[PDB]
C-alpha cells in the first residue's frame with residue numbers, strides 16, 4: 223500500500239509518524255521546528271494555519287495563505303519529507319499544491335464550496351476525517367445511536383462523493399476524527415474498533431496526541447498527556463493504523479519501532 | 493473473573509495491574525520508594541534481595557533473609573499493596589510468607605532443592621517464569637515448559653488456581669525471540685492462568701532503538717501496552733506512574749471492546 227504525490231511516494235508498509243506544525247520570526251521558527259521533527263523521525267509534517275479546536279474563530283483566506291504557504295514552500299525546498307496541509311479552503315488547497323504539499327488534510331472533508339473540485343484538480347492524496355457538525359458547536363452535545371456505524375456510513379458516503387468528483391480510491395485516507403463531535407466514550411468505542419475500518423482497504427490516519435480523550439480520562443492538563451498519547455498511538459498502530467499524527471515525534475517514533483518489531487513477528491491485531 | 497488470594501486479601505485480575513520494582517540487592521529508603529510507587533498507582537510491589545541480573549553476586553541464606561525479610565515485613569505492616577518476593581531459596585520463601593508476602597516470584601521456577609515444597613507449604617500464588625540462545629519455535633518451547641512446570645506444581649500440591657505464567661522476556665532470548673513471544677502473547681491464555689510480563693527497560697527495547705537504560709521509557713510503555721492489549725494481567729516495571737497512565741488508556745479501550753482482548 224502506497225501513496226503518490228509531487229513525484230515521490232510514501233510506503234505505508236509500516237506506521238508513519240506525522241509531526242504537527244501549528245502555525246496559528248514565524249517562518250524561521252516554523253522551519254526550525256520542522257527540522258527537529260524530521261530529525262526525530264517524522265516522515266510527514268502537518269502544517270495548519272486555522273484553529274480546529276472547539277469554538278475556534280474562522281480565519282480569512284488571505285491570513286491563512288500568509289501563515290501556511292511560505293511554510294510549506296520553505297520545507298518543500300529544503301527537505302525531502304512529505305507535507306500535509308490542514309485546510310478547508312479551495313484557494314489554500316491550490317496554492318499549497320503549487321508549492322509542493324503532498325497531502326490535503328481537511329477536517330471538513332472538502333465540504334466547503336469549491337473544495338472538492340480544487341482537491342481533485344491537484345491530483346493529491348486527500349484525507350477524509352469524520353466530524354459530527356462543525357467545530358463551532360460539535361462539542362456541545364455529541365450524540366450517536368451507534369458511533370462506529372455512523373462513522374463507517376460517513377466513510378462510505380464520502381468515498382462515493384470523492385470518486386464521483388474524479389478522486390480515485392487510491393488517493394484517499396480515512397480518519398475517524400477523534401475528538402471531533404465525540405465524547406470520551408465515543409472516542410474509545412472508535413479506538414477499540416479501529417481495525418474494522420480496514421475493510422475499505424484504505425490508509426488509516428489517526429490523531430489522538432494530547433487530546434481530551436486522554437485528559438478527561440486521566441484528569442490532567444495538556445502537558446501531562448505523553449504516556450496516554452503513546453498508549454493511544456500504540457493501540458492504533460497495533461491495529462494497523464498507517465499514519466499517527468502527533469506533537470511528540472521522538473517518543474512516538476520509538477514506540478512505533480516496537481510496534482513494527484512486534485507486527486513483523488506476527489502472522490495485525492483485532 | 494480471574495482472582496488471586498493471599499494473606500487474607502485478593503487481587504482482582506479483571507483489569508491490568510502495575511507491579512513496581514523495589515531493588516534492595518536503607519529500610520527507611522526501601523519504604524519511601526515503596527510509598528512513591530504506591531502513590532503512583534502500583535498495586536503490587538516486587539521485592540528482590542538477590543539480584544536476578546546476569547552474573548549478579550550470589551548471597552548466603554542468612555544475607556538474603558537479612559536483606560529481604562525486614563523489607564517485606566515493613567511494607568506489609570504499612571501498606572495494603574500486594575507484595576511479590578523475588579527469591580529461589582526455600583528458607584526465604586518460608587520466612588517471606590510468614591511476614592506477609594503475597595506472591596512467590598521465582599525466576600528459577602522453584603528449581604532449587606526444597607523450593608517447590610516450601611512454596612507449596614505457604615499456600616501462596618506462584619509465578620512460573622521461562623528461562624533458558626536458540627529455539628526451533630520459541631513459543632512452542634515456552635509453551636512446553638509451562639505445561640511441564642504446571643504439572644510439576646500440581647503434583648506437589650500447588651493447584652492451578654495459584655499459578656501465574658511469565659514468558660521471561662530477556663531470559664535466554666535474543667531480540668527476535670522476545671518479539672516473537674510478545675506478538676503471540678495472547679495465545680498463552682489457553683492455560684486459563686494469569687499472565688505476568690516484565691519488559692521494562694530491557695534489551696529487547698535497548699537493542700531495537702539503540703538507546704541506553706535511562707532512555708527506554710517510550711519503548712517500555714509500548715511493550716506494556718502491547719502486552720496489556722493482549723490481556724496480560726500484571727506488568728512489572730520501573731516507571732510506575734507512566735505505566736499506570738498507559739494502562740488506564742488500555743482499560744478504557746478494552747471496556748469498549750466486545751472480545752475484551754486483542755489477538
Ligand SMILES: Cn1cnc2c(O)nc(N)nc21
Nearest residue numbers: 274308351397399400428429
Ligand atoms: C488538523 N487536525 C487536528 N486533529 C486532527 C485529527 O485528529 N485528524 C486529522 N486528519 N487532522 C487533524
Ligand SMILES: Cn1cnc2c(O)nc(N)nc21
Nearest residue numbers: 544578619621658660661690
Ligand atoms: C525478578 N524479575 C526480573 N525480571 C523478571 C521478569 O521478566 N519476570 C519476573 N516474573 N520476574 C522478573
